Write a protein that binds this DNA or RNA. Structure first.
Ligand SMILES: CC(C)CC[C@@H](O)[C@](C)(O)[C@H]1CC[C@@]2(O)C3=CC(=O)[C@@H]4C[C@@H](O)[C@@H](O)C[C@]4(C)[C@H]3CC[C@]12C
Lengths: 78, 236, 87
DNA sequence: CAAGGGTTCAATGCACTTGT
DNA sequence: GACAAGTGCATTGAACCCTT
């Protein structure tokens, strides 16, 4: 029923602390697992919605953080 | 999500071996009965072939772990009740969906029409339905061997050490559980499979009574049912 | 005036003319893949999805219909020229 | 069963190479 | 060159599995 708090896509439930879609779930997992750092090619205020969330990895990750996603909730690879 | 002991696999192995060891009657026996280059012909073959089937079924039963631990009284008790029900598992294995017929050990296909002629017209419509149901079941030779074993140590009336057999059976019942638990992800469907299989037991009980009624409705038609069969199925 | 060259299919930033239509890399690749496989898609909605950056990933049937409607030429995807007899 | 951890892998799309 | 067609492959995310 819920919406992803990051992008507005249909949430599949809570993930890593926040209501979020499979997209943002999968993205946050891969970012934390690999310990990736991104660089915005704009002004670090890019639009992150259901339409253009894939345009800026830095801004998508920062928005996961601001929404309340917890790096600690991401477990070791199994 | 465990595997199986050595016993278990030695048994499964063993059972899969005896099964092929006895699926058909020897080349000489088969040759002797099938000699020949009028409603007594289909009748003779069907009845004569059944006497071979039963024999094989009996010997297989003795090649079973724990069987010799049974009182001769019980042994003839278990065997006497299983004879007709296993013979059922074995007609399923030689059923051909393409022709809806049963294939005798001499490679001949017997249709619902042949069983008519021989006066077995009563037993066939149901026997063939059970085959179609065992077909879509799609079972492997382990199942079939294990299942068979089970049927044999199935609780029967007249049993002296009833509680004994129950366990001699609990083993095979258990082995089957495991083998199914490995062959597929020990997931939900794992029981669903174990169940449909154990269900074969109850259907095999209905086809057993029909075989008996056929023996009856045959003695009554004054038609010599081999003494051997009349004896083993308690056909009065 | 022209602040951004627009993909005629989805409205994403167009990278150039692909198979005779101003399209993004996403729609270019989707169209080429759809044509080379001769893919037949089945919309699981109402057979009338408006294409954007969200819906383009959601409905392959309507995206392909939009690619054609915009003027993408399927005959221009790996035609039988000398270069193809190569690979 | 549901939730929220996990994983998978075909489709995707960015960056590239090839041909004119 | 600059463009458009073709290619390589890392990333995406819908659909699963697993444990509480
Ligand atoms: C009353 C009694 C005679 C009736 C029994 C009938 O209804 C049955 C069940 O229909 C009988 C008739 C003949 C029959 O004994 C057989 C012939 C074979 O050739 C073979 C011999 C041997 O390879 C068996 O492992 C399988 C099979 C196909 C058996 C199965 C049971 C059959 C098919």
């Amino acid at each position: 029923k819920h919406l992803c708090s990051i992008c507005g896509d249909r949430a599949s439930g809570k993930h890593y602390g926040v209501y979020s879609c499979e997209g943002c779930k999968g993205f946050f997992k891969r970012t934390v697992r690999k310990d990736l750092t991104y660089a915005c090619r704009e002004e670090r205020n890019c639009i992150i919605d259901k339409r253009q969330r894939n345009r800026c990895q830095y801004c998508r990750y920062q928005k996961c953080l601001a929404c309340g996603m917890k790096r600690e909730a991401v477990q070791e690879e199994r | 999500v465990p595997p199986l002991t050595a016993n278990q696999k030695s048994l499964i192995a063993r059972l899969v071996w005896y099964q092929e060891g006895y699926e058909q009657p020897s080349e000489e026996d088969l040759k002797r009965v099938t000699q020949t280059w009028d409603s007594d012909m289909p009748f003779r073959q069907i009845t004569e072939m059944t006497i071979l089937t039963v024999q094989l079924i009996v010997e297989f039963a003795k090649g079973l772990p724990g069987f010799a631990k049974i009182s001769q009284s019980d042994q003839i008790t278990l065997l006497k009740a299983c004879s007709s029900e296993v013979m059922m598992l074995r007609v399923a294995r030689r059923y051909d969906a393409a022709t809806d017929s049963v294939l005798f050990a001499n490679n001949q296909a017997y249709t619902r029409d042949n069983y008519r002629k021989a006066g077995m017209a009563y037993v066939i419509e149901d026997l063939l339905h059970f085959c179609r149901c065992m077909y879509s079941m799609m079972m492997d030779n382990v199942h079939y061997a294990l299942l068979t074993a089970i049927v044999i140590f199935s609780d029967r009336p007249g049993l002296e050490q009833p509680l004994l057999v129950e366990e001699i059976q609990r083993y095979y019942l258990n082995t089957l559980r495991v083998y199914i638990l490995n062959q597929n992800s020990a997931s939900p469907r794992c029981a669903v499979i174990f169940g449909k299989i154990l269900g074969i037991l109850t259907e095999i009980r209905t086809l057993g009574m029909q075989n008996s009624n056929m023996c009856i409705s045959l003695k009554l038609k004054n038609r010599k049912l081999p003494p051997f069969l009349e004896e083993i199925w308690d056909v009065a | 005036r022209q602040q951004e060259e627009l993909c005629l299919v989805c409205g994403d930033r167009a990278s150039g003319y692909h198979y005779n239509a101003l399209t993004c890399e996403g729609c270019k690749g989707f169209f080429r893949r759809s044509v080379t496989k001769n893919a037949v898609y089945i919309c699981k909605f109402g057979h009338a999805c408006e294409m954007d950056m969200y819906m383009r990933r959601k409905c392959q049937e309507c995206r392909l219909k939009k690619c054609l409607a915009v003027g993408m030429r399927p005959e221009c995807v790996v035609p039988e020229n000398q270069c193809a007899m190569k690979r």
